[PDB]
Design an enzyme around this catalytic site. Structure first.
Site, short mmCIF file in Angstrom:
data_model
loop_
_atom_site.label_atom_id
_atom_site.label_comp_id
_atom_site.label_asym_id
_atom_site.label_seq_id
_atom_site.Cartn_x
_atom_site.Cartn_y
_atom_site.Cartn_z
N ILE A 16 0.69 -1.30 -0.12
CA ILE A 16 0.03 -0.09 -0.19
C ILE A 16 0.76 1.28 0.04
CG2 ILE A 16 -1.80 -1.11 1.08
CD1 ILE A 16 -1.25 0.31 3.85
N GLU A 23 8.96 -1.39 2.19
CA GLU A 23 7.57 -1.13 1.65
C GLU A 23 6.66 -1.23 2.76
OE1 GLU A 23 9.93 -2.98 0.12
OE2 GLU A 23 9.68 -1.38 -1.36
N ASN A 135 -1.72 13.09 5.67
CA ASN A 135 -1.07 12.45 6.77
C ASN A 135 -2.27 12.13 7.98
OD1 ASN A 135 1.43 11.64 6.51
ND2 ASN A 135 2.07 13.71 6.38
N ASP A 148 1.84 9.96 10.32
CA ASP A 148 2.97 10.70 9.42
C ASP A 148 3.54 9.49 8.62
OD1 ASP A 148 4.84 12.25 8.65
OD2 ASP A 148 5.79 12.44 10.32
C1 LIG Z 1 2.33 1.01 9.59
C2 LIG Z 1 2.35 2.44 10.04
C3 LIG Z 1 3.80 2.84 10.35
C4 LIG Z 1 3.93 4.18 10.91
C5 LIG Z 1 2.85 5.18 10.89
C6 LIG Z 1 3.09 6.38 11.44
O1 LIG Z 1 1.75 7.21 11.60
N1 LIG Z 1 4.02 7.10 11.91
C7 LIG Z 1 4.24 7.81 12.66
C8 LIG Z 1 5.63 8.61 12.94
C9 LIG Z 1 5.65 9.66 13.62
C10 LIG Z 1 4.75 10.49 14.40
C11 LIG Z 1 5.04 11.58 15.30
N2 LIG Z 1 6.28 12.11 14.89
C12 LIG Z 1 5.86 12.93 13.33
C13 LIG Z 1 6.98 13.50 12.95
N3 LIG Z 1 7.90 14.37 13.89
C14 LIG Z 1 9.13 15.20 13.54
C15 LIG Z 1 8.12 14.04 15.31
C16 LIG Z 1 6.70 13.28 15.69
C17 LIG Z 1 3.36 10.10 14.00
C18 LIG Z 1 2.22 10.71 14.75
F1 LIG Z 1 2.29 11.31 15.96
F2 LIG Z 1 2.04 11.99 13.93
F3 LIG Z 1 0.91 9.87 14.43
C19 LIG Z 1 3.08 8.78 13.36
C20 LIG Z 1 1.77 4.68 10.68
C21 LIG Z 1 1.28 3.63 9.90
N4 LIG Z 1 0.41 3.27 9.31
C22 LIG Z 1 -0.34 3.37 8.30
N5 LIG Z 1 0.17 3.68 7.07
C23 LIG Z 1 -0.22 3.84 6.07
C24 LIG Z 1 0.55 4.03 4.95
C25 LIG Z 1 0.40 4.19 3.59
C26 LIG Z 1 1.27 4.60 2.25
C27 LIG Z 1 2.57 4.85 2.85
N6 LIG Z 1 2.93 5.06 4.23
C28 LIG Z 1 2.18 4.74 5.16
N7 LIG Z 1 -1.51 3.58 5.57
C29 LIG Z 1 -2.34 3.10 6.70
C30 LIG Z 1 -1.67 3.04 7.96
C31 LIG Z 1 -2.95 2.34 8.60
N8 LIG Z 1 -3.95 2.19 8.13
N9 LIG Z 1 -3.36 2.55 6.65
C32 LIG Z 1 -4.12 2.71 5.48
#
Ligand SMILES: Cc1ccc(C(=O)Nc2ccc(CN3CCN(C)CC3)c(C(F)(F)F)c2)cc1Nc1nc(-c2cccnc2)nc2c1cnn2C
Length: 269
Positions: A16, A23, A135, A148
């Site tokens: 995805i 990936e 995001n 993010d």
């Molecule tokens: C697996 C996974 C791993 C990681 C993240 C993630 O949210 N990371 C995260 C990193 C950091 C922060 C806070 N920091 C931000 C930067 N600052 C400098 C410091 C603070 C946060 C925060 F707090 F903001 F939430 C979140 C999300 C997913 N899951 C998804 N991802 C994708 C997806 C699609 C296409 C490409 N990539 C991803 N699709 C998804 C899901 C779930 N459903 N679907 C349909």
């Protein structure tokens, strides 16, 4: 703050998206659906530190409007970050595919949720730096969860963050104002076809995005105050959440609409 998941409990199915060095998959966790970010072999020391560091901060977060970490695979290769799966996907695409299908109250509820997640993030001493509808994930209850996915987002970024790299909660508030406009327009491109340099010049010269169609006056006033040049004059996220909660609880307050400046004039008798 992170649970370790055994690889035999995880099934990857479709790709995805992509990450820094891996990936992103849709998958199943023993079966609840999940999203899976992998770190693939040959990753560098810096990539490992960033990857596990991301897992670490994510496991710390426990909030209704922040994406939930299910766990991590660190003791085996490939390493994995596993979150809940949000079935309606990213907010910007979601609203573009459902144009005009929601009530004003539903749209403002989305913004209140996003603001609540950001208030939590900021008070936990994290700066997002890339807050945009792309995001934000939407679940089957219409709950928005700050996320993010990685990337230059000039149109969303406060002047001081562009001009001298000062990224703070207050530059996130600027971005939130842009997200408010994204939501109320059902995913329109901020500043339409203006180039990045034209956007910066307009903002420096005092211009700001016009009101969306059918937009509550109170909501446009709030997004306008997110875009104050002087960072200290912007609301804090606590102020944003408080105002949005008062508008939602007194919903007649959203019936007063800001004037929409027509771009086209139709003369008929
Ligand atoms: C697996 C996974 C791993 C990681 C993240 C993630 O949210 N990371 C995260 C990193 C950091 C922060 C806070 N920091 C931000 C930067 N600052 C400098 C410091 C603070 C946060 C925060 F707090 F903001 F939430 C979140 C999300 C997913 N899951 C998804 N991802 C994708 C997806 C699609 C296409 C490409 N990539 C991803 N699709 C998804 C899901 C779930 N459903 N679907 C349909």
């Amino acid at each position: 703050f992170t649970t370790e998941i055994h690889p035999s409990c995880v099934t990857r199915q479709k790709v995805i998206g992509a990450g820094e060095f891996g990936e992103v998959y849709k998958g199943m966790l023993k079966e609840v659906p999940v999203a899976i970010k992998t770190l693939k072999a040959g990753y560098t020391e810096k990539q490992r530190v960033d990857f596990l560091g991301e897992a670490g901060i994510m496991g710390q977060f426990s909030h209704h409007n922040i994406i939930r970490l299910e766990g991590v695979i660190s003791k085996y290769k490939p390493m994995m970050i596993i979150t809940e799966y949000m079935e309606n996907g990213a907010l910007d695409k979601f609203l573009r595919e459902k144009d005009g299908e929601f009530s004003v109250l539903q749209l403002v509820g989305m913004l209140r949720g996003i603001a609540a997640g950001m208030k939590y993030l900021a008070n936990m001493n994290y700066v997002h730096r890339d807050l945009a509808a792309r995001n934000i994930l939407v679940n089957s209850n219409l709950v928005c969860k700050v996320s993010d996915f990685g990337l230059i987002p000039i149109r969303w970024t406060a002047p001081e963050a562009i001009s001298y790299r000062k990224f703070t909660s207050a530059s996130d508030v600027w971005s939130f104002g842009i997200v408010m406009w994204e939501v109320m327009t059902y995913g329109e491109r901020p500043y339409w076809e203006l180039s990045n340099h034209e956007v910066m010049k307009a903002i420096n010269d005092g211009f700001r995005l016009p009101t969306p169609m059918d937009c509550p006056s109170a909501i446009y006033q709030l997004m306008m105050q997110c875009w104050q040049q002087e960072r200290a004059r912007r609301p804090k996220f606590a102020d944003i959440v408080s105002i949005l909660d008062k508008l939602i609880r007194a919903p007649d307050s959203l019936k007063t609409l800001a004037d929409f400046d027509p771009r086209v004039s139709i003369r008929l008798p």
